[PDB]
Ligand binder design. Structure first.
Ligand SMILES: NC(=O)c1ccc[n+]([C@@H]2O[C@H](COP(=O)([O-])OP(=O)(O)OC[C@H]3O[C@@H](n4cnc5c(N)ncnc54)[C@H](OP(=O)(O)O)[C@@H]3O)[C@@H](O)[C@H]2O)c1
Ligand SMILES: NC(=O)c1ccc[n+]([C@@H]2O[C@H](COP(=O)([O-])OP(=O)(O)OC[C@H]3O[C@@H](n4cnc5c(N)ncnc54)[C@H](OP(=O)(O)O)[C@@H]3O)[C@@H](O)[C@H]2O)c1
Ligand SMILES: NC(=O)c1ccc[n+]([C@@H]2O[C@H](COP(=O)([O-])OP(=O)(O)OC[C@H]3O[C@@H](n4cnc5c(N)ncnc54)[C@H](OP(=O)(O)O)[C@@H]3O)[C@@H](O)[C@H]2O)c1
Lengths: 474, 474, 474, 474
């Protein structure tokens, strides 16, 4: 079998055991990845803590140059990495190549953002005359060893979104990709290896999170945990973190509030784009439409027609709708579809599943009584919930324990801004679908959608600390 | 008995049960405080979540005006509050009045700092040309309901340091003082009552943390936990917080590194000041001296003479050394004193204890083998540890699991700055004893000394979130 | 005669000559103000440069406390100062009292903003690895002696808007009010006297700007010139300043662009409010309406009716329209009214003048061929210019050499934001009349409307410099 | 003759007249540069104003990409450009190549700094409750057409230091190099031509500043003037600028204050380095030593020995001391040398001049009575002025009308910081010679040394304005 290895302390290492990866669309074996032992995890961490001081001792610009090299390498090999990524997570080929490209972009942005974090000089005289000669020189510092964990839908992108901001500031990294997507995670590891960062600065970990995950997170050598994945695991990590700092990017159930003065055609296209992207396997995605009854029939018919225009098929054919990541996922979605249907929702699209490929389905007349109204499906299923007032829309929206983003389709901005203030979310997009879009922008979620604020600059600030040196001037 | 009441939803409330408070120096009953039931805790929280929206709806300036009123009231009644505080925690009278004064100051500072937190407008064109018409309007928002918990040595000051920054930003408060110091905490509550903040915006909780503490922290109505106290409880809270945000100010074992070119007299006075303040019952306090052998004998003799000049007695007499907060504390300190002595340390001061009053004691020749070298005593005991190199001083320093602050006494600044970079602490004071000093300055601890960065501006930033609204310009 | 005196170096001083002030509405003598000699100007300046070092030596908080005292005094005596201000510049009584109140507010805000200006610590390693041990500690510093000059329509408010930001930062002040409004300027001086600022820190100058103005500005002892007044004098000062820093707030001819989807009633009320405030004697005031022909007739009739509802009379009666500041002004306005009329504009309101009181007049069908379309009148005359496209509105708008503010009345925000980007002005108000409104907001003008950016924070930044101290860490 | 051309609106243009350039060391003709007519100046400006809108319409990243191309090209041709620059201004070859390299660096830094300038969102509720629904979205904007003028000692570097920061923000450029150094200025122009920026965005102007200088500055099409050169011309421009914004980098007479606890050897080397660099033809250069009498003899002898180790000769031989830019300059320096000598100063080095090459000379016993103590020579002549107290050193220092930078050599930092506060300069270097060093650091001068604050970030902020859009949220 094609056995991939972990990058540990400047070397590539296999383990006594391996995990075989298959393509979610065909079942074909892709290769295997190591199933690390806790002793091997200990060595990755011991390696990193050892290398940190010297990494931190480099100049900011030297660290940015290393990262620029990594990004340059990713661009060079984007078709290579993209071909395997496409196969490993059953995501269209072109979009797979786009993930790699977006990764290089965030690595290059974090590299230039990080060498520009400034410190402050504060005056004691601002607080008390007696301390007017006392000044504080405050400068940032790395937290130490950061553990980064990416999800299956963006194993590379959502790894680089953590690695670059961490490294530029002087921290060292321990990266653990998702098992289904670990081969791609190791292909990214190759770029860091070629760029030539000092041994121990960047390392990878592989094994089933359901088996060594608690171990790698509870390990006291870990100073910070940056995670992207399910709410349930985030809750776990939040506790396993203790008083240690963390950044969680969890579930989302983004709602699209459509008022009566919205451009329905523009609204229909955005909802379709955000709802069915990557078969609905996106955290920031319109997962429920709360529309005003008076415009609902018209919006729904447009959405209905558009759903029928989506392509369905294999990743290599760049189909809009591809097979879900695994059988358990497709089964879970089916149960949501069933609960809705059996409960009276109106399926405006055919319910059909072949293997783990579920055709896109539009559900009208969904009520707050159906599971599909609240639970994140992570499949191509979109519920339409008709409301009779903006206040109800807000009520139903905020009712969710999720609060990533939201879209408001209307032409009344001052009103749209008033609504946005009440929406318990991180970002509100006016007349656009939701998105992490433009990584210089803050990215955070409310309630059980996460902890911490991301976006390049915020990530950097979050994974650094401060060192205040106070003295008196004579 | 003089029964104090909790301030809940605009009203003062007693509970079926009470807890009687005594003066640590005389044993005299001071009065009693309610022992709230979990049902009463639920009502405090339900009251606050209900009042939050309307409080958040006020203008920043309106909220600052309320807070300026509270501070003004504290200044007016500073002798009143200070007389009881002095008695409740056996701290000198004048210093007790100073705590109240310092509280008013931080309340007034946080009030003016909070109405000056600005948002940002970001450009999509910074990241990608295609999103050049996309801009992000980012504005801050409260986290919701904040639970504040102060320690016994600063029940008022270290409560106000949490309440003001929280309220100015729109958050609502649930304040729980320490049982020994709860009467004073309710005297501060009186100021918020007189200032007239809306019912539910500010409330207090009382009962033994060892009994209802886990309950008030685990309560899902709580959105943020700001705590000041022991490491053990902080660890607890860190876990009980889940993925919820928290700010912990825990233990410290501040070291004073004395190089060979230090002004020994100036060094001796600072160490004495920071080491014996409030009988060593201060978190930011020189708790261990790591001095260069060649200057050790001279520094120790000065410190020895100065220790003998300290006054010992009752809080009402403004004595330097007053009785420790309680019997268990005095006993714990005595064991530290004993371990050191039996192990060979050189007591340069008489070991004497009367009741819970422990005379100040200087220990020379302390080794890393004695408990006193590592454990936070919270008593008037100072260990002197002689080193033979700056590298050893740093080694022994960083060896502690504590990392609040540190002092470096030397006349070589560039070198002092190089050392400060290696010291695993929050703040490094050059030629001054450690201190939270000047609240506009950041205040944080490394390792097990805490989580989060305080100081007025940082507190505010920490207890707020962000709301990003993205739209496109045509 | 009631002879007012200048506050010079802690003392009040008369001059050999005086200038008698009369009430613009009745002609009644108000008192007299000194007509300083250049030698007296030299002493004010010598006094200030002498006092600066010690003022700069105070703590920020000490300087903010002085300013808070001044504001508190202004609030106490607001009816007193307002009664004379109302009489000196023929402005309604209540609005006069409001000027004083607004002054206290900006003095208090600048006081709290100034003790919060922070410095920076920069890394050489951001630019070059070789300089990675080199850090820069950058801290702000006063420019020195600032000369402040207020206009007749806001002699107190627009003096305090310069004095407070200057003083908080450590600068010393030389204040020169307008001759017509100098008595009120000296009443403000009284507040600084009572607050007890050190001798020389704050002083006043009086005499006709047309006679000693060039002298006080060209004086080399002056380090910065902050001026509010006419464009012609601003141009002058710009040149007399040399390479010295200045801040000019000059003329304005604010346009109100009314698109076809505007709420005409809300638009009509805002235009009326901003156009006729203080008889049109305001810099930030809608001075020309560029409306879409299709909605023009309707908007004009509303505006016509509202103009007729305005009150006309004496300041003491709080009339909307009061007598203009002087005869030359009323004559100038009349000529504008005449040029328009003789040229064919449609006067929808009666042309009437009594003394120097000019009734409000609305002119429809104004063309770019009439003086009234371009020249700032500073009288109750409003021209309506009908356009046929948004592009023409922008063309005609930007055609003016003035660029203070602008209002856009429309319900299309993305479009409104696109237009705002093309308008050559400082601030663009959407669905509101123009205004300096909320002093924490930036206030600046484009083209010949000024130099520099104001608003509290910006004023402070503008009247301070930086001191960079660079050293290497070993 | 080799006739260079100006880059105007995407094309290279000669003029009817030309100016022949010769090498200051050999007299050899280097080529010729156009002597533009005012009509040609008008076309350069008309071209730029025409191209600005579309340049401003590009995305920030697109503009940074153009600039990165220019820098990359400069690096590629650094030996080429450096060979001619070395010959045109008689500066060593390797240092000439270093100027080009440093230019690319500042162009690349400004490019990444500029796409990271953020805007702000301000709340009306911070100032008044009534405006709590009113928010201000403040975004930066270019000033328009910027006129950049570099000096002869850094025609390329100090051109790029103005061009890049200007362009990245959306401004267009009109660049005018010094006549002696115009050929090199046009070689830089070639890089902007090859990078392919749109026609009109970047253009050059050539002709004698003494003949067309006033014209190009007074031209109303110019929105901002960024100049580096003599104080006399800066004064001129300051006036010709009117109320228009400008940035002036003028003369300097940097002093090196040497206290009694300084490391004399380290001090001697720095003074030599900063004083004799480029034959003393540097603005930021130790131009006068104010040393404590007790350490003066020792410091002077060290400096004396080192001066004798400096190399003297031709630029191509990379000599330390090369021929001065021109005859008038050498004559001027000679007069300073003469005034000092005839007045009693002690020349510790031989006074010798061949052609325009003046050997380095050290003058001890200089007094405040000699011209050399105050006037900027721009030649290899260093005066030593012995003082008897730190207070006198400060007095004599601040006595100069110059205030660029200063060095303080001492081991007492708190004291050094106190002195730095009193020194009327832009930057104070502790134990290092003065320097513009590390372009991310602020660079400004006090008194007659300039106007405005430079350093990448500050340059960008200085050549941009703000556009505030205010609306209310419903
Ligand atoms: N908000 C955002 O920014 C964001 C972005 C994209 C996706 N997501 C969310 O992610 C979910 C889909 O991703 P997923 O199914 O890959 O998530 P998941 O099941 O929570 O797992 C994601 C990652 O966590 C690991 N993991 C599992 N148990 C762990 C343990 N206790 N300790 C440490 N790590 C552990 C996995 O390793 P294994 O693969 O071996 O189990 C993997 O690296 C959705 O909820 C979606 O909304 C969030
Ligand atoms: N780092 C800093 O900024 C800072 C400042 C000052 C002091 N300190 C630290 O605080 C300690 C001394 O103060 P302390 O003895 O008051 O600390 P503590 O015994 O840890 O208790 C602190 C506070 O926690 C409450 N509490 C106890 N257990 C609880 C639990 N189960 N869950 C939630 N709340 C509970 C207490 O109420 P009850 O009294 O009813 O238990 C009290 O208000 C030292 O370790 C010291 O250095 C830290
Ligand atoms: N942009 C803004 O924020 C702002 C605000 C309000 C008004 N304005 C503008 O100001 C004008 C109306 O105000 P105004 O009549 O007070 O203006 P002005 O006649 O130009 O005078 C302004 C001030 O300058 C003084 N002065 C006259 N000549 C001077 C000189 N050569 N040197 C130094 N000072 C001199 C005056 O004292 P004397 O009384 O002795 O002449 C007065 O204090 C209008 O054009 C208006 O739009 C601008």
């Amino acid at each position: 079998t094609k056995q991939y290895k972990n990058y540990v302390n400047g070397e590539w290492k296999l383990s006594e055991n391996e995990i075989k990866i298959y393509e979610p669309a065909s079942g074909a074996e892709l290769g295997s990845v190591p199933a690390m032992s806790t002793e091997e995890v200990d060595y990755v961490y011991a390696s990193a803590k050892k290398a940190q001081p010297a990494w931190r001792a480099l100049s900011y610009i030297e660290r940015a140059a290393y990262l620029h090299k990594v990004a340059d390498i990713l661009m060079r090999d984007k078709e290579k990495i993209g071909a395997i990524l496409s196969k490993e997570v059953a995501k269209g080929y072109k979009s797979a190549v786009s993930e790699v490209v977006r990764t290089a972009e965030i690595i290059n942005y974090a590299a230039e953002e990080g060498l520009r974090m400034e410190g402050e000089v504060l005056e004691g005289g601002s607080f008390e005359a007696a301390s007017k000669k006392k000044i504080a020189v405050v400068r940032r510092e790395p937290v130490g060893l950061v553990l980064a964990i990416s999800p299956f839908n963006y194993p590379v992108n959502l790894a680089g979104s953590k690695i670059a901001p961490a490294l530029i500031a002087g921290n060292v990294i321990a990266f653990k990709p998702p098992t289904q997507g670990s081969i791609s995670g190791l292909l990214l590891a190759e770029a860091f290896a070629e760029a030539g960062l000092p041994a121990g600065v960047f390392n990878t970990i592989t094994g089933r999170g359901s088996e060594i995950g608690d171990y790698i997170v509870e390990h006291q050598a870990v100073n910070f945990i940056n995670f992207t994945g399910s709410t349930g695991i985030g809750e776990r990590i939040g506790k396993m973190a203790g008083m240690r700092p963390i950044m969680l990017e969890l579930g989302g159930k983004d709602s699209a509030i459509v008022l009566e003065d919205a451009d329905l055609e523009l609204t229909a296209k955005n909802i379709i784009a955000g709802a069915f992207g990557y078969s609905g396997q996106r955290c920031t995605a319109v997962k429920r439409v709360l529309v005003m009854e008076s415009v609902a029939d018209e919006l729904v018919e447009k959405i209905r027609e558009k759903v029928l225009a989506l392509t369905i098929g294999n990743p290599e054919d760049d189909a809009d709708i591809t097979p879900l990541i695994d059988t358990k996922s497709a089964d879970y979605v089916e149960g949501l579809i069933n609960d809705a249907n059996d409960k009276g929702a109106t399926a405006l699209t055919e319910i059909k599943r072949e293997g783990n490929l579920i055709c896109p389905i539009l559900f009208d007349k969904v009520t707050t009584d159906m599971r599909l109204a609240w639970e994140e499906p992570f499949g191509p299923v979109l519920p339409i919930i008709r409301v009779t007032s903006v206040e109800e829309a807000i009520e139903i929206s905020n009712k969710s324990e999720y609060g990533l983003q939201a879209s408001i389709f209307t032409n009344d901005f001052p009103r749209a801004f008033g609504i946005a203030e009440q929406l318990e979310v991180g970002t509100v997009h006016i007349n656009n679908k939701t998105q992490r879009g433009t990584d210089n922008f803050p990215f955070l979620g409310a309630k059980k959608s996460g902890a911490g604020i991301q976006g390049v600059k915020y990530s950097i600030e979050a994974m650094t600390t401060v060192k205040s040196v106070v003295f008196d001037i004579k």
